[PDB]
Design a protein around this motif. Structure first.
Motif, PDB file in Angstrom:
ATOM      1  N   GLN A 255      10.730   4.335   2.230  1.00  0.00           N
ATOM      2  CA  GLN A 255      10.543   5.775   2.146  1.00  0.00           C
ATOM      3  C   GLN A 255      11.360   6.294   0.970  1.00  0.00           C
ATOM      4  O   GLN A 255      12.581   6.109   0.929  1.00  0.00           O
TER       5      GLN A 255
ATOM      6  N   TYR B 273       8.679  -1.088   5.332  1.00  0.00           N
ATOM      7  CA  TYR B 273       8.467   0.249   4.797  1.00  0.00           C
ATOM      8  C   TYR B 273       9.598   0.626   3.850  1.00  0.00           C
ATOM      9  O   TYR B 273      10.755   0.246   4.053  1.00  0.00           O
TER      10      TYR B 273
ATOM     11  N   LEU C 248       7.411   9.744  -0.949  1.00  0.00           N
ATOM     12  CA  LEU C 248       6.315   8.786  -0.953  1.00  0.00           C
ATOM     13  C   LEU C 248       6.684   7.611  -0.060  1.00  0.00           C
ATOM     14  O   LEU C 248       7.814   7.121  -0.103  1.00  0.00           O
ATOM     15  N   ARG C 249       5.726   7.157   0.742  1.00  0.00           N
ATOM     16  CA  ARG C 249       5.946   6.060   1.675  1.00  0.00           C
ATOM     17  C   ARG C 249       5.204   4.826   1.180  1.00  0.00           C
ATOM     18  O   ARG C 249       3.988   4.870   0.970  1.00  0.00           O
ATOM     19  N   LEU C 250       5.937   3.732   0.997  1.00  0.00           N
ATOM     20  CA  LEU C 250       5.371   2.441   0.642  1.00  0.00           C
ATOM     21  C   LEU C 250       5.406   1.532   1.860  1.00  0.00           C
ATOM     22  O   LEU C 250       6.392   1.517   2.603  1.00  0.00           O
ATOM     23  N   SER C 251       4.336   0.774   2.064  1.00  0.00           N
ATOM     24  CA  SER C 251       4.248  -0.153   3.179  1.00  0.00           C
ATOM     25  C   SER C 251       3.819  -1.514   2.659  1.00  0.00           C
ATOM     26  O   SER C 251       3.187  -1.620   1.607  1.00  0.00           O
TER      27      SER C 251
ATOM     28  N   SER D 100       0.855  -1.180   0.000  1.00  0.00           N
ATOM     29  CA  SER D 100       0.000   0.000   0.000  1.00  0.00           C
ATOM     30  C   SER D 100       0.893   1.233   0.000  1.00  0.00           C
ATOM     31  O   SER D 100       2.097   1.154   0.263  1.00  0.00           O
ATOM     32  N   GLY D 101       0.286   2.380  -0.302  1.00  0.00           N
ATOM     33  CA  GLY D 101       0.967   3.656  -0.226  1.00  0.00           C
ATOM     34  C   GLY D 101       1.500   4.201  -1.531  1.00  0.00           C
ATOM     35  O   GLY D 101       2.128   5.268  -1.522  1.00  0.00           O
TER      36      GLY D 101
END
Lengths: 48, 114, 117, 48, 48
Positions: free
Chosen positions: B81, B79, B18-21, B7-8
Protein backbone atom coordinates in the motif's frame (compact mmCIF):
# COMPACT_ATOMS: atom_id res chain seq x y z
CA UNK A 1 4.23 -34.44 -2.94
CA UNK A 2 5.80 -34.31 -6.40
CA UNK A 3 8.25 -36.64 -8.10
CA UNK A 4 10.54 -33.58 -8.02
CA UNK A 5 9.84 -32.88 -4.33
CA UNK A 6 13.27 -32.31 -2.81
CA UNK A 7 14.38 -34.56 0.05
CA UNK A 8 16.40 -32.58 2.57
CA UNK A 9 19.72 -33.68 4.05
CA UNK A 10 20.51 -33.98 7.75
CA UNK A 11 21.16 -31.14 10.21
CA UNK A 12 24.52 -32.03 11.73
CA UNK A 13 25.04 -30.62 15.20
CA UNK A 14 28.04 -28.30 15.29
CA UNK A 15 30.72 -30.61 16.66
CA UNK A 16 34.42 -29.93 17.01
CA UNK A 17 35.37 -32.24 14.13
CA UNK A 18 33.08 -30.33 11.76
CA UNK A 19 34.78 -27.12 12.90
CA UNK A 20 38.07 -28.85 12.08
CA UNK A 21 36.69 -29.82 8.67
CA UNK A 22 36.03 -26.16 7.90
CA UNK A 23 39.36 -25.16 9.47
CA UNK A 24 41.37 -27.49 7.22
CA UNK A 25 39.60 -26.22 4.08
CA UNK A 26 39.75 -22.56 5.12
CA UNK A 27 41.84 -20.21 2.97
CA UNK A 28 44.15 -18.00 5.05
CA UNK A 29 46.28 -16.98 2.05
CA UNK A 30 44.47 -14.06 0.37
CA UNK A 31 43.93 -10.84 2.28
CA UNK A 32 42.30 -7.92 0.42
CA UNK A 33 44.69 -5.10 -0.43
CA UNK A 34 44.48 -1.68 1.23
CA UNK A 35 43.89 -0.03 -2.13
CA UNK A 36 44.21 3.68 -2.90
CA UNK A 37 40.80 5.37 -3.05
CA UNK A 38 39.89 8.88 -4.11
CA UNK A 39 40.04 11.34 -1.22
CA UNK A 40 36.71 12.02 0.46
CA UNK A 41 35.66 15.23 2.20
CA UNK A 42 37.48 16.46 5.30
CA UNK A 43 34.47 15.66 7.52
CA UNK A 44 32.72 12.37 6.76
CA UNK A 45 28.97 12.82 7.24
CA UNK A 46 26.94 9.90 8.56
CA UNK A 47 24.73 8.65 11.39
CA UNK A 48 24.27 5.24 12.99
CA UNK B 1 6.94 -24.34 -11.23
CA UNK B 2 6.48 -21.21 -9.12
CA UNK B 3 4.79 -18.17 -10.68
CA UNK B 4 4.40 -14.63 -9.33
CA UNK B 5 1.75 -12.35 -10.85
CA UNK B 6 1.42 -8.70 -9.82
CA UNK B 7 -1.47 -6.30 -10.36
CA UNK B 8 -2.81 -2.94 -9.24
CA UNK B 9 -0.33 -0.54 -10.82
CA UNK B 10 -1.45 2.65 -12.55
CA UNK B 11 -0.72 6.38 -12.68
CA UNK B 12 -1.26 8.28 -9.45
CA UNK B 13 -1.28 11.92 -8.34
CA UNK B 14 1.09 13.36 -5.75
CA UNK B 15 -0.13 12.50 -2.27
CA UNK B 16 -2.49 9.83 -3.60
CA UNK B 17 -2.69 6.15 -2.74
CA UNK B 18 -2.18 3.00 -4.78
CA UNK B 19 -2.48 -0.68 -3.85
CA UNK B 20 -0.17 -3.27 -5.42
CA UNK B 21 -0.92 -6.98 -5.12
CA UNK B 22 0.96 -10.13 -6.10
CA UNK B 23 -0.39 -13.68 -6.14
CA UNK B 24 1.71 -16.85 -6.03
CA UNK B 25 1.07 -20.19 -7.71
CA UNK B 26 3.11 -23.33 -7.10
CA UNK B 27 4.29 -22.80 -3.52
CA UNK B 28 2.63 -22.42 -0.14
CA UNK B 29 4.78 -19.36 0.82
CA UNK B 30 4.54 -20.33 4.48
CA UNK B 31 7.75 -19.54 6.33
CA UNK B 32 9.09 -17.72 3.28
CA UNK B 33 9.94 -14.03 3.23
CA UNK B 34 8.61 -11.70 0.55
CA UNK B 35 9.60 -8.32 -0.79
CA UNK B 36 8.77 -5.42 -3.07
CA UNK B 37 11.51 -3.75 -5.13
CA UNK B 38 11.32 -0.84 -7.53
CA UNK B 39 13.48 0.05 -10.53
CA UNK B 40 13.68 3.70 -11.51
CA UNK B 41 14.48 4.55 -15.15
CA UNK B 42 18.25 4.25 -15.48
CA UNK B 43 18.84 3.18 -11.87
CA UNK B 44 19.38 -0.20 -10.26
CA UNK B 45 16.42 -2.20 -9.00
CA UNK B 46 16.31 -1.24 -5.32
CA UNK B 47 14.71 -2.73 -2.22
CA UNK B 48 11.51 -0.99 -1.10
CA UNK B 49 10.03 -3.29 1.54
CA UNK B 50 10.40 -6.78 2.97
CA UNK B 51 7.94 -8.77 5.07
CA UNK B 52 8.57 -12.08 6.81
CA UNK B 53 6.15 -14.98 7.24
CA UNK B 54 5.59 -14.04 10.88
CA UNK B 55 4.59 -10.54 9.77
CA UNK B 56 7.74 -8.58 10.64
CA UNK B 57 8.45 -5.71 8.25
CA UNK B 58 11.67 -4.03 7.09
CA UNK B 59 11.53 -0.80 5.09
CA UNK B 60 13.98 1.41 3.21
CA UNK B 61 14.72 4.98 4.25
CA UNK B 62 12.89 6.90 1.53
CA UNK B 63 9.76 4.74 1.90
CA UNK B 64 9.27 4.32 5.64
CA UNK B 65 6.09 5.87 7.01
CA UNK B 66 4.61 6.23 3.52
CA UNK B 67 4.39 2.60 2.35
CA UNK B 68 3.01 -0.45 4.16
CA UNK B 69 3.76 -4.04 3.12
CA UNK B 70 1.38 -6.82 4.17
CA UNK B 71 0.82 -10.45 3.27
CA UNK B 72 -1.67 -13.31 3.53
CA UNK B 73 -0.18 -16.79 3.71
CA UNK B 74 -3.64 -18.36 3.49
CA UNK B 75 -4.40 -16.50 0.24
CA UNK B 76 -0.73 -16.71 -0.86
CA UNK B 77 -0.65 -13.00 -1.69
CA UNK B 78 1.57 -10.00 -0.92
CA UNK B 79 0.27 -6.42 -0.78
CA UNK B 80 2.06 -3.07 -0.93
CA UNK B 81 0.00 0.00 0.00
CA UNK B 82 1.56 3.27 -1.20
CA UNK B 83 0.31 6.36 0.63
CA UNK B 84 1.44 9.96 0.12
CA UNK B 85 3.29 9.14 -3.09
CA UNK B 86 6.06 11.44 -4.34
CA UNK B 87 7.68 11.80 -7.78
CA UNK B 88 10.66 9.68 -6.66
CA UNK B 89 8.24 6.74 -6.30
CA UNK B 90 7.88 6.49 -10.10
CA UNK B 91 9.25 3.28 -11.57
CA UNK B 92 8.60 -0.38 -12.25
CA UNK B 93 7.70 -2.29 -9.10
CA UNK B 94 8.60 -5.99 -8.87
CA UNK B 95 7.52 -8.55 -6.28
CA UNK B 96 9.90 -11.20 -4.96
CA UNK B 97 9.52 -14.48 -3.08
CA UNK B 98 12.71 -15.13 -1.10
CA UNK B 99 12.53 -18.87 -1.78
CA UNK B 100 14.68 -21.68 -3.15
CA UNK B 101 14.89 -19.61 -6.35
CA UNK B 102 15.07 -16.03 -7.57
CA UNK B 103 11.29 -15.75 -7.72
CA UNK B 104 10.35 -12.42 -9.33
CA UNK B 105 7.19 -10.98 -10.83
CA UNK B 106 6.57 -9.45 -14.24
CA UNK B 107 6.67 -5.87 -12.96
CA UNK B 108 4.04 -3.12 -13.00
CA UNK B 109 4.61 0.56 -13.73
CA UNK B 110 3.74 3.28 -11.20
CA UNK B 111 3.93 6.89 -12.43
CA UNK B 112 3.43 9.80 -10.03
CA UNK B 113 1.98 12.73 -11.96
CA UNK B 114 1.81 16.41 -11.03
CA UNK C 1 56.95 23.24 0.74
CA UNK C 2 57.99 26.57 2.26
CA UNK C 3 56.65 28.10 5.48
CA UNK C 4 57.91 31.44 6.80
CA UNK C 5 56.59 33.11 9.95
CA UNK C 6 56.53 36.78 10.93
CA UNK C 7 55.59 37.93 14.42
CA UNK C 8 56.41 40.68 16.86
CA UNK C 9 59.62 40.12 18.78
CA UNK C 10 58.66 41.15 22.30
CA UNK C 11 56.06 42.67 24.60
CA UNK C 12 55.74 42.59 28.37
CA UNK C 13 52.77 40.65 29.78
CA UNK C 14 49.24 41.98 29.51
CA UNK C 15 49.14 42.76 25.78
CA UNK C 16 48.54 41.07 22.43
CA UNK C 17 50.23 39.88 19.23
CA UNK C 18 49.47 38.76 15.68
CA UNK C 19 51.70 36.04 14.24
CA UNK C 20 51.67 35.24 10.55
CA UNK C 21 52.81 32.20 8.57
CA UNK C 22 53.05 32.53 4.78
CA UNK C 23 53.11 29.29 2.80
CA UNK C 24 54.27 28.40 -0.69
CA UNK C 25 54.11 25.20 -2.72
CA UNK C 26 50.56 24.21 -1.72
CA UNK C 27 47.14 25.59 -0.83
CA UNK C 28 46.97 26.34 2.90
CA UNK C 29 43.24 25.59 3.02
CA UNK C 30 43.76 21.97 1.96
CA UNK C 31 45.93 20.66 4.83
CA UNK C 32 45.74 20.47 8.61
CA UNK C 33 48.16 22.96 10.15
CA UNK C 34 49.46 23.58 13.67
CA UNK C 35 51.12 26.20 15.84
CA UNK C 36 53.84 24.83 18.12
CA UNK C 37 56.24 26.69 20.42
CA UNK C 38 59.58 25.65 21.89
CA UNK C 39 60.98 27.20 25.05
CA UNK C 40 64.79 27.49 25.12
CA UNK C 41 66.29 24.31 26.53
CA UNK C 42 63.06 22.31 26.31
CA UNK C 43 60.94 20.24 23.95
CA UNK C 44 58.03 21.35 21.82
CA UNK C 45 54.53 22.20 23.03
CA UNK C 46 51.46 22.07 20.79
CA UNK C 47 49.84 25.51 20.84
CA UNK C 48 47.03 25.28 18.28
CA UNK C 49 45.81 23.68 15.07
CA UNK C 50 43.48 24.40 12.15
CA UNK C 51 41.51 22.01 9.90
CA UNK C 52 41.00 22.39 6.14
CA UNK C 53 37.30 22.83 6.98
CA UNK C 54 38.16 26.02 8.89
CA UNK C 55 37.72 24.48 12.34
CA UNK C 56 40.43 25.33 14.87
CA UNK C 57 41.46 23.53 18.07
CA UNK C 58 43.67 24.93 20.82
CA UNK C 59 45.32 22.97 23.61
CA UNK C 60 45.57 23.58 27.33
CA UNK C 61 48.02 26.44 26.75
CA UNK C 62 45.98 29.57 25.96
CA UNK C 63 42.46 28.26 25.45
CA UNK C 64 40.26 31.33 25.22
CA UNK C 65 43.41 33.47 24.99
CA UNK C 66 44.68 32.69 21.47
CA UNK C 67 42.63 32.26 18.31
CA UNK C 68 43.84 30.58 15.12
CA UNK C 69 42.62 31.98 11.80
CA UNK C 70 43.53 31.50 8.16
CA UNK C 71 43.22 33.55 4.97
CA UNK C 72 42.72 31.44 1.85
CA UNK C 73 43.25 34.24 -0.68
CA UNK C 74 46.40 35.47 1.07
CA UNK C 75 47.40 31.83 1.75
CA UNK C 76 48.45 32.77 5.25
CA UNK C 77 47.91 31.28 8.71
CA UNK C 78 47.31 33.76 11.55
CA UNK C 79 47.65 33.40 15.33
CA UNK C 80 45.95 36.16 17.34
CA UNK C 81 47.40 36.12 20.86
CA UNK C 82 45.99 38.10 23.75
CA UNK C 83 46.89 38.33 27.45
CA UNK C 84 50.46 37.12 27.04
CA UNK C 85 52.35 35.79 30.06
CA UNK C 86 56.07 35.31 30.79
CA UNK C 87 55.79 31.52 30.50
CA UNK C 88 54.74 32.04 26.85
CA UNK C 89 58.33 32.93 25.89
CA UNK C 90 59.94 30.87 23.15
CA UNK C 91 60.37 30.31 19.43
CA UNK C 92 57.09 29.75 17.60
CA UNK C 93 56.74 27.62 14.46
CA UNK C 94 53.83 26.85 12.15
CA UNK C 95 54.07 23.07 11.84
CA UNK C 96 52.50 21.12 9.00
CA UNK C 97 50.63 18.43 10.98
CA UNK C 98 47.82 18.13 13.50
CA UNK C 99 48.82 18.38 17.18
CA UNK C 100 52.43 18.36 15.98
CA UNK C 101 54.47 17.85 19.16
CA UNK C 102 57.81 16.73 17.66
CA UNK C 103 59.71 16.72 14.37
CA UNK C 104 58.20 13.96 12.21
CA UNK C 105 59.75 12.65 8.96
CA UNK C 106 57.93 13.96 5.91
CA UNK C 107 56.76 17.02 7.86
CA UNK C 108 57.60 20.60 6.91
CA UNK C 109 58.46 23.34 9.39
CA UNK C 110 59.34 27.01 9.49
CA UNK C 111 62.49 28.70 10.75
CA UNK C 112 60.63 30.10 13.77
CA UNK C 113 59.75 33.46 15.32
CA UNK C 114 61.06 34.82 18.62
CA UNK C 115 58.41 35.80 21.19
CA UNK C 116 59.59 37.08 24.58
CA UNK C 117 57.08 38.19 27.20
CA UNK D 1 52.82 -15.27 12.97
CA UNK D 2 50.98 -12.81 15.28
CA UNK D 3 47.75 -11.07 14.40
CA UNK D 4 49.27 -7.72 15.45
CA UNK D 5 52.67 -7.53 13.74
CA UNK D 6 53.94 -4.46 15.60
CA UNK D 7 54.53 -3.36 19.20
CA UNK D 8 52.22 -0.38 19.72
CA UNK D 9 52.58 2.21 22.49
CA UNK D 10 50.26 5.19 22.92
CA UNK D 11 53.20 7.65 22.97
CA UNK D 12 54.62 6.37 19.67
CA UNK D 13 54.85 9.27 17.19
CA UNK D 14 52.32 9.43 14.39
CA UNK D 15 53.41 8.21 10.96
CA UNK D 16 50.16 8.16 8.97
CA UNK D 17 50.33 4.44 8.10
CA UNK D 18 49.48 2.57 11.31
CA UNK D 19 49.72 5.32 13.97
CA UNK D 20 47.91 8.57 13.21
CA UNK D 21 45.13 10.96 14.09
CA UNK D 22 41.94 10.12 12.21
CA UNK D 23 38.38 11.31 11.64
CA UNK D 24 35.62 8.75 11.05
CA UNK D 25 32.00 9.41 9.97
CA UNK D 26 30.22 11.78 12.33
CA UNK D 27 26.92 13.63 12.55
CA UNK D 28 28.74 16.97 12.25
CA UNK D 29 32.27 18.24 12.85
CA UNK D 30 34.45 15.94 14.96
CA UNK D 31 37.81 16.49 16.61
CA UNK D 32 40.41 14.05 15.20
CA UNK D 33 41.52 11.32 17.58
CA UNK D 34 44.72 9.28 17.71
CA UNK D 35 44.23 5.73 16.41
CA UNK D 36 46.36 2.66 15.74
CA UNK D 37 46.07 0.19 12.86
CA UNK D 38 46.75 -3.16 14.51
CA UNK D 39 45.96 -5.29 11.44
CA UNK D 40 44.62 -4.90 7.92
CA UNK D 41 41.22 -3.13 8.12
CA UNK D 42 41.47 -3.20 11.96
CA UNK D 43 41.87 0.08 13.86
CA UNK D 44 41.79 0.83 17.59
CA UNK D 45 40.88 4.21 19.10
CA UNK D 46 41.74 4.34 22.83
CA UNK D 47 39.11 7.02 23.49
CA UNK D 48 35.80 7.10 25.32
CA UNK E 1 44.44 -14.76 22.37
CA UNK E 2 41.50 -15.01 19.96
CA UNK E 3 43.76 -15.45 16.91
CA UNK E 4 45.78 -18.17 18.69
CA UNK E 5 42.76 -20.49 18.74
CA UNK E 6 41.65 -22.18 15.53
CA UNK E 7 38.11 -20.79 15.66
CA UNK E 8 39.29 -17.27 16.44
CA UNK E 9 41.84 -17.41 13.62
CA UNK E 10 39.01 -18.23 11.22
CA UNK E 11 36.82 -15.48 12.72
CA UNK E 12 39.43 -12.75 12.35
CA UNK E 13 40.29 -13.92 8.83
CA UNK E 14 36.61 -13.77 7.81
CA UNK E 15 36.26 -10.32 9.38
CA UNK E 16 39.28 -8.98 7.46
CA UNK E 17 38.16 -10.17 4.02
CA UNK E 18 34.54 -9.11 4.58
CA UNK E 19 35.01 -5.65 3.05
CA UNK E 20 31.78 -3.59 3.02
CA UNK E 21 30.16 -3.66 -0.40
CA UNK E 22 30.76 -0.83 -2.88
CA UNK E 23 27.04 -0.23 -3.24
CA UNK E 24 27.06 3.57 -3.16
CA UNK E 25 26.49 4.11 -6.89
CA UNK E 26 23.03 5.18 -8.02
CA UNK E 27 23.91 3.89 -11.51
CA UNK E 28 23.69 0.10 -11.76
CA UNK E 29 26.67 -0.08 -14.14
CA UNK E 30 29.10 1.57 -11.68
CA UNK E 31 30.77 0.60 -8.40
CA UNK E 32 31.04 3.43 -5.87
CA UNK E 33 32.33 3.09 -2.32
CA UNK E 34 30.22 4.22 0.63
CA UNK E 35 31.76 7.07 2.61
CA UNK E 36 30.61 5.83 6.02
CA UNK E 37 32.68 2.65 5.54
CA UNK E 38 35.89 4.72 5.41
CA UNK E 39 37.99 7.03 7.59
CA UNK E 40 40.35 9.96 7.05
CA UNK E 41 43.93 9.43 8.26
CA UNK E 42 45.95 12.61 8.77
CA UNK E 43 49.44 12.36 7.28
CA UNK E 44 52.53 14.03 8.78
CA UNK E 45 52.68 16.54 5.90
CA UNK E 46 49.17 17.75 6.80
CA UNK E 47 47.28 16.11 3.96
CA UNK E 48 44.68 13.48 4.78
Amino acid sequence: ITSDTNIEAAEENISLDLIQQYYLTFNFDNEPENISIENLSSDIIGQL
Amino acid sequence: QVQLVESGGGLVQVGGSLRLSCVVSGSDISGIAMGWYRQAPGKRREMVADIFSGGSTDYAGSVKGRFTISRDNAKKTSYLQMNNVKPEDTGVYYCRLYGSGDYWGQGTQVTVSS
Amino acid sequence: VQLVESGGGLVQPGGSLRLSCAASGFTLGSRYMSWVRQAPGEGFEWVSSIEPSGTAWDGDSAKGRFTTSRDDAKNTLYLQMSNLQPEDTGVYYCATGYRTDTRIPGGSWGQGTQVTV
Amino acid sequence: MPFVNKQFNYKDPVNGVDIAYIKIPNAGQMQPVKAFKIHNKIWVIPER
Amino acid sequence: RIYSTDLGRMLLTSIVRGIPFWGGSTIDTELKVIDTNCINVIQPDGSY
